Amino acid sequence: GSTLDGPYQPTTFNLPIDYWMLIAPTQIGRVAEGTNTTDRWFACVLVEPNVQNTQREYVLDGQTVQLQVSNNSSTLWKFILFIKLEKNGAYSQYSTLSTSNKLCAWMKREGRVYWYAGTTPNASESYYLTINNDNSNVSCDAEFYLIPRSQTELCTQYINNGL
Numbered sequence: 816g817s818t819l820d821g822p823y824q825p826t827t828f829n830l831p832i833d834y835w836m837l838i839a840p841t842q843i844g845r846v847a848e849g850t851n852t853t854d855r856w857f858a859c860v861l862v863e864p865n866v867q868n869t870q871r872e873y874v875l876d877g878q879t880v881q882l883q884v885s886n887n888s889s890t891l892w893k894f895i896l897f898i899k900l901e902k903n904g905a906y907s908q909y910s911t912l913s914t915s916n917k918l919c920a921w922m923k924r925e926g927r928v929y930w931y932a933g934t935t936p937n938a939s940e941s942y943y944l945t946i947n948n949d950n951s952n953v954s955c956d957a958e959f960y961l962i963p964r965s966q967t968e969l970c971t972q973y974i975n976n977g978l
């Protein structure tokens with residue numbers, strides 16, 4: 816079987832640059848969040864298949880917020896990447912990952928957070944937001960693995976095919 820660095824228990828930490836944090840939730844809802852503390856608060860949420868547009872509640876950046884989610888796939892799970900741009904602002908939707916595998920991943924590099932998006936088995940790191948703060952903390956509600964950038968091909972493989 817595949818051998819990855821992990822699983823690590825859920826925590827809040829200063830994710831080192833140039834590592835994929837491959838997150839492996841078992842529960843729907845909030846999966847992970849991060850912030851540069853200045854103009855980006857980002858969060859991913861997991862939605863099960865066959866969900867008509869609806870408003871659910873999540874605790875993001877400490878606050879209970881109401882966000883519209885949907886997933887019109889009868890079979891694929893959907894991670895949604897939400898971002899707010901100021902401390903007191905509202906979250907907007909920026910990217911999604913539709914997947915049979917229930918894994919998502921992001922990386923801090925080049926002052927950005929890269930994110931796997933698309934539809935498995937063809938998800939790719941096509942999306943990023945800009946944070947310009949290498950010491951940005953990430954909070955994770957799920958177990959996760961760390962994959963160095965040299966093994967990006969393996970991260971892509973796991974996102975798309977599972978472990």
Ligand SMILES: CC(=O)N[C@@H]1[C@@H](O)[C@H](O[C@@H]2O[C@H](CO)[C@H](O)[C@H](O[C@H]3O[C@H](CO)[C@H](O)[C@H](O)[C@H]3NC(C)=O)[C@H]2O[C@@H]2O[C@@H](C)[C@@H](O)[C@@H](O)[C@@H]2O)[C@@H](CO)O[C@H]1O
Pocket residue numbers: 898909941942943944945946
């Ligand atoms: C459907 C589709 O193909 N859309 C493409 C856009 O996604 C592309 O826009 C850029 O996409 C990037 C991710 O792949 C990234 O999100 C980027 O914005 C981010 O990076 C810039 C600097 O490079 C800024 O710092 C932004 O603030 C940052 N976004 C966040 C939320 O932090 C996108 O670039 C922005 O959007 C594009 C369209 C231009 O208007 C830029 O001036 C913006 O900065 C892009 C293709 O690469 O166009 C679409 O086709």
